[PDB]
Design a protein around this ligand. Structure first.
Ligand SMILES: [Zn+2]
Lengths: 169, 665, 50, 92, 261
DNA sequence: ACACACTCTCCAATTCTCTAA
């Protein structure tokens, strides 16, 4: 509950699988603290903190998606990049909940503009065509290229199962 | 509450890190672990969590917590192995006490977590809930302990013993003697943990190896290899053999009985003696498979399943039946059998042992366990040196204990003693049957008078209180003693021992025993048969005899013999030789023919003798057909002399005084 | 007949005688790796200044 | 109520359809020969008893017929009276 | 509570399987062919295991001629005529040998799941046509040839399954599938009776690669006045996407029978 | 409404145990 792990303590996965290690409360709190500490602190060579400059423009356009480069996340706190590649569906939930704290630090009451923010990953360093995908890739993050052959119309979809919706295509 | 539960789990987890950790300066990728502080208090409080809380509340929750945080695999083994390897290097060269303190206290937890599991109607609902899961985790423990550095933690446990071997018994304090009990108490558990037994609540009538475990991890074969490389067998051998010289016998010699039980269990002795070979016997077995295939083919139609016509069969009194299929057209035997087979009902049926680990008493032992060649020869060497070195000195001590302590016994110690006796006596008889280098003197402590009384007394007391499992084991032990006696008579005091073994009281008991066997499991009846064969054969070579044999011959014994004989598809070639020996005794010698004129015997001889059952060339058919020929000749004579026996053949014989005498003869 | 005495055993006990790339990269980097956050707050305060 | 169950009973055995038929015919039915195998002659004996058991009480498998017969055969006094009567007839 | 153990559970066992297992074991150990250049024993299958260890492979190739000359041919006959019965025993035999000489191969950081080895055979005595497939040969070992005409995309097939109950915190593991998607029969915790609302744990369960391909007879082999027949073939593991439409191929495996699911 | 799959319930058939002649 109260005590937190060091970053070096996370070097050893202690449970029988990654997902069952990320989802533990002390591990999860440690990851949240470390991600927030990365987002408030990463710099260009010129100082000039890029993510403090991106959150600033998020509100200038009344937007909903924060964009994070993977190479920056791999350049320090490397283990978090590894966990992201292995368990994206958990890691992105924690990362989204950190991004809202960081944006509200610039713009208090931004929750009245949009209730929830999505982190977009960029520059993932390995690529497949639609040949190389196999069962080992299941639930892993992947990067793919091709031509868009067909597109449906846009529809609303029920978000939770009082009601809320989201767009779908 | 759930939160109090997880608070204790978290307390344990924090203790699972306060313990220490490896070194990230090291640049040695990876190093070993490195040591914490308060760690004495950490170990001690964990010990308290077991003893002062979980035992007092009867939970097994604490064990579930330590299994969650993987304490055994993660810390205890490297703490011990580092202590061992450090001290090993120091010995190669040829506060330190504090290191040794940590070595002791890590081992005591290893004994505690791997301790074997018992469930009763007095265990808590918590323990009953957790039984199936902690079984999985203990299986993981066995695999891990045998695996690390090819099992090197087992050298740490014996080095601890070697400190207390070291200096004279005259010096050795009670606290000191507990180490020598503790070390052996460890190996008992490591052998005893084995795959689970499935258990459910009988509310409604409707594998447990975890994903990380497999059979070759857990097999007894593995355990042999592991102990041999890590130098255990020398320790058990040296320790048992010099046992008579003033090691205080009291602290060692029951734990040291349990080891010998716990890995004699699940071996048939013939597997240790041979009596391209594998390929040759495989080819022969494929011939047997072809014969079974031929048997199916002989009941298979040539043309397809919808070609089939219809058949009608007319009885006397002009009544008709209908059966389908093309083979029924030609084979009346098949038509008659197929006619009855359609009918729905079967009479529902009745059913003896619980509370103890799998063994000869409640499993079919016609199923070996399997050895590497190196393992086969190493195991043969271990028990051969044990027998030539240790057996008499061990049995003499453990028996003259139990005579002074019989009243206080518990069911397991009884069933251990009776299945350690049995194994070693039989194996030696077989070994000297094979070869002249071996001799019978090595097992000769079994015969002296005190042990004979004790096996007798166990069998007596078990029979009176209707405890059927001890009665079963005692039957097995008492069988071997008699077998050993006939050996020694085929070479003084032994006749005295016989005369005392065959006082009238015991003949009443040993005559009584097959009669009750009719109800019970297939092994129980088999024990009764083999004991009976031996019991009569000794008294045949005593030269009384006519009194004793008439004591055996009556309806409820014959009932057992047939009830056992009809399950012949499952039994050995040898046991049927024993049954027909007895029928030869009843029918030809004693001339008590009237017992066997009963119909369910006549069915049996058709099944077994048909092209269905006993092979056309097994030795069994010689005996069976030679018996049935004589049977039917005497039956013919009886039926024509007195036609009332046609209605006799269905029913039991009739016990009236005035007609019954002429009936039986 | 054998004997297997103590003193022999003590004496003989002692004397006897591609993600494959990326995983290695990230593990080694992981092993190798308020004023610090001032640049962030400076970017926030520049809205006040400019 | 549900329909009561139908069973083998000593009344069926003591009926004229029952056991007297076997004693009236068995001497004529079965015939052994040394000129045929043990298995041959052994098989032959069971034929008549099987067909008779079916004709008497078709409920159940042949073995179950024999084993059912044991209970009533040992317990019922009237059946035992009939049986001692048979063996007295031979004592006559 | 009326707790009760399955005291009667002790299973029936096939002796032929265990003897085939520990005979195939000895063949893998000591086939002991001499060197291509010299009269020196080489032990090629142990060397092949070492090669697999060096490159983290998952399949082993065996020559049917080498098996034919072993132990008067009885082992080869048993494998040939009853492959479907004996394939699990062959797997069990190989697992022990790889444990003995290369335990690094048994696993595929947290814990690592076991490697699903594949045995493969080649150089069989004769090749059949698609027109020679007949129901008497079901489950035997064969080799076939033809021209490829279609191929399917690679799909994941469920091999072993694991489920967890909705009404209580309980888990079921290592459920076996065969031809249709299959789920547990009871809640293992006796404090709960719900049979519904299982969910398949995608992390703990295990899958395989699977591909369907379709072939037709070689044009030069068609008999007089007749037309070419076709067949559907299954590919799994490290052999998917090896085949190409319009090419000519040779296959080996066992013919099977598939139900109306 | 018409064959099916599945659940629930009650009643008597059966075997086991104790007592006395
Ligand atoms: Zn449930």
């Amino acid at each position: 509950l109260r005590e937190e792990l060091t970053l070096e303590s996370l070097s050893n996965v202690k449970a029988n699988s990654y997902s069952e290690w990320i989802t533990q409360p002390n591990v999860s709190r440690t990851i949240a603290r470390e991600l927030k500490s990365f987002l408030l602190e990463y710099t260009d060579e010129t100082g000039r903190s890029v993510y403090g400059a991106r959150i600033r423009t998020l509100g200038e356009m009344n937007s909903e998606s924060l964009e994070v480069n993977y190479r920056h996340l791999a350049e320090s706190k490397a283990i978090l990049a590894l966990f992201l590649a292995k368990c994206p569906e958990e890691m992105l939930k924690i990362f989204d909940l950190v991004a809202m704290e960081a944006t509200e630090l610039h713009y208090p009451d931004y929750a009245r503009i949009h209730s929830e923010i999505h982190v977009r990953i960029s520059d993932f360093p390995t690529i497949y065509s639609l040949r190389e995908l196999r069962e080992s890739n299941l639930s892993s993050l992947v990067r793919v290229t091709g031509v868009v052959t067909r597109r449906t119309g846009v529809f609303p979809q029920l978000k939770y199962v009082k009601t809320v919706y989201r767009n779908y295509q | 509450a759930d939160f109090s539960l997880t608070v204790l789990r978290a307390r344990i987890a924090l203790l699972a890190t306060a313990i220490g950790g490896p070194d990230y300066t090291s640049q040695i990728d990876p190093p070993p672990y490195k040591l914490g502080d308060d760690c004495l208090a950490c170990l001690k409080d964990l010990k308290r969590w077991f003893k002062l809380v979980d035992d007092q509340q009867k939970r097994w929750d604490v064990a579930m917590a330590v299994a969650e945080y993987r304490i055994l695999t993660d810390d205890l083994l490297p703490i011990l192995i580092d202590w061992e390897n450090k001290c090993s290097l120091a010995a190669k060269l040829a506060n330190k006490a504090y290191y040794d303190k940590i070595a002791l206290n890590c081992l005591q937890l290893l004994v505690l977590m791997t301790w074997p599991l018992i469930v009763t109607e007095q265990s808590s609902s918590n323990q009953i809930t957790l039984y199936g899961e902690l079984k999985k985790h203990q299986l993981v423990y066995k695999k891990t302990i045998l695996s690390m550095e090819s099992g090197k933690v087992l050298r740490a446990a014996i080095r601890l013993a070697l400190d207390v071997i070291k200096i004279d018994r005259l010096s050795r304090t009670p606290r000191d003697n507990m180490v020598l009990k503790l070390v052996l108490n460890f190996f008992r558990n490591v052998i005893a943990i084995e795959p689970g037994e499935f258990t459910i609540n009988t509310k409604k009538s409707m594998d447990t190896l975890p994903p990380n475990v497999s059979m070759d991890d857990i097999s007894l074969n593995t355990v042999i290899s592991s102990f041999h490389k890590n130098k255990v067998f020398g320790f058990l051998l040296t320790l048992t053999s010099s046992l008579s010289k003033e090691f205080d016998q009291d602290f060692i010699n029951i734990p040291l009985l349990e080891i010998m039980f716990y890995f004699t269990k699940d071996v048939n002795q013939e597997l240790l003696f041979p009596r391209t070979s594998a390929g040759f016997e495989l080819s022969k077995l494929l011939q047997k498979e072809h014969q079974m295939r031929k048997n199916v083919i002989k009941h298979t139609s040539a043309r397809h399943s919808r070609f089939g016509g219809l058949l009608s069969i007319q009885t006397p009194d002009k009544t008709r039946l209908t059966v389908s299929g093309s083979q029924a057209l030609v084979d009346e035997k098949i038509a008659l059998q197929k006619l009855d087979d359609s009918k729905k009902w079967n009479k529902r049926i009745i059913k003896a042992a619980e509370g103890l680990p799998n063994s000869l008493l409640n499993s079919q032992t016609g199923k070996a366990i399997f050895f590497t060649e190196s393992n086969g020869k190493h195991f043969k060497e271990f028990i051969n040196n044990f027998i030539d070195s240790g057996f008499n000195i061990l049995l003499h001590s453990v028996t003259n204990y139990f005579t002074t302590e019989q009243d206080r016994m518990v069911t397991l110690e009884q069933v251990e003693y009776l299945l350690f006796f049995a194994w070693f006596v039989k194996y030696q008889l077989l070994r000297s049957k094979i070869d002249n280098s071996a001799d019978i003197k090595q097992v000769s402590e079994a015969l002296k008078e005190v042990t004979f009384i004790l096996v007798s007394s166990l069998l007596r007391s078990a029979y009176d209180l209707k405890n059927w499992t001890v009665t079963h084991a005692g039957m097995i032990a008492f069988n071997e003693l008699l077998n050993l006696v006939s050996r020694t008579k085929a070479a003084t005091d032994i006749e005295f021992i016989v005369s005392r073994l065959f006082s009238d009281e015991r003949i009443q008991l040993l005559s009584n025993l097959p009669k009750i066997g009719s109800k019970y499991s297939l092994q129980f009846m088999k024990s009764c048969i083999e004991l009976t064969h031996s019991v009569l054969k000794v008294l045949e070579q005593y030269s009384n005899f006519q009194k004793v044999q008439a004591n055996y011959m009556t309806e409820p014994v014959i009932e057992t013999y047939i009830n056992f004989l009809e399950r012949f598809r499952e039994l050995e070639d040898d046991s049927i030789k024993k049954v027909f020996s007895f029928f030869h005794r009843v029918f030809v010698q004693a001339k008590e023919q009237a017992l066997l004129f009963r119909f369910d015997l006549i069915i049996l001889l058709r099944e077994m003798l048909s092209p269905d059952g006993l092979d056309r060339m097994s030795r069994s058919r010689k005996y069976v057909s030679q018996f049935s020929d004589y049977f039917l000749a005497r039956l013919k004579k009886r039926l024509k002399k007195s036609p009332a026996w046609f209605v006799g053949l269905l029913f039991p014989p009739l016990h009236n005084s005035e007609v019954g005498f002429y009936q039986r003869y | 007949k054998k004997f297997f005495s103590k003193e022999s055993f003590l004496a003989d006990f002692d004397d006897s005688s591609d993600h494959n790339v990326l995983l290695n990269t990230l593990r080694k980097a992981s092993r190798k790796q308020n004023p610090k956050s001032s640049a962030f707050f400076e970017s926030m305060v520049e809205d006040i200044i400019e | 109520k549900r329909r009561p169950q139908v069973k083998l009973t000593a009344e069926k055995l003591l009926s004229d359809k029952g056991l007297p038929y076997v004693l009236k015919n068995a001497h004529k039915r079965i015939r052994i020969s040394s000129k045929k195998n043990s298995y041959d002659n052994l098989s032959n004996i069971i034929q008549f008893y099987q067909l008779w058991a079916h004709e008497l009480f078709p409920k159940a498998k042949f073995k179950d017929f024999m084993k059912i017969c044991q209970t009533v055969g040992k317990t019922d006094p009237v059946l035992r009276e009939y049986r001692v009567s048979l063996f007295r007839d031979e004592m006559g | 509570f009326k707790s009760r153990a399955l005291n009667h559970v002790k299973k029936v066992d096939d002796v032929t399987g265990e003897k085939v297992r520990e005979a195939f074991e000895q063949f893998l150990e000591d086939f002991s062919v001499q060197s291509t250049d010299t009269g020196e024993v080489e032990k090629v299958y142990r060397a092949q295991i070492e090669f697999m260890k060096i490159y983290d492979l998952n399949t082993i190739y065996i020559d049917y001629q080498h098996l034919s000359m072993r132990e008067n041919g009885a082992l080869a006959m048993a494998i040939s005529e009853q492959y479907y019965r004996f394939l699990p025993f062959l797997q069990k035999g190989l697992r022990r040998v790889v444990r003995k000489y290369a335990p690094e191969l048994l696993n595929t950081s947290p814990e690592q799941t076991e490697r699903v080895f594949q045995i493969s055979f080649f150089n069989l005595p004769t090749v059949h046509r698609i027109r020679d497939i007949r129901s008497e040969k079901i489950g035997s070992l064969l080799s076939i040839s033809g021209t490829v005409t279609r191929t399917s995309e690679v799909r994941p097939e469920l091999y072993k399954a694991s489920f967890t109950c909705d009404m209580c915190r309980a888990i079921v593991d290592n459920v076996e599938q065969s031809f249709k998607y299959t789920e547990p029969t009871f809640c293992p915790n006796p404090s709960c009776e719900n049979r519904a609302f299982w969910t398949l744990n995608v992390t703990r369960s295990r899958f395989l690669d699977w591909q369907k391909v379709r072939i037709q007879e070689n044009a030069n082999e068609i008999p007089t006045g007749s037309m070419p027949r076709t067949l559907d073939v299954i590919l799994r593991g490290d052999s998917v996407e090896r085949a190409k439409p319009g090419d000519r191929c040779k296959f080996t495996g066992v013919e099977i029978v598939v139900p109306d699911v």
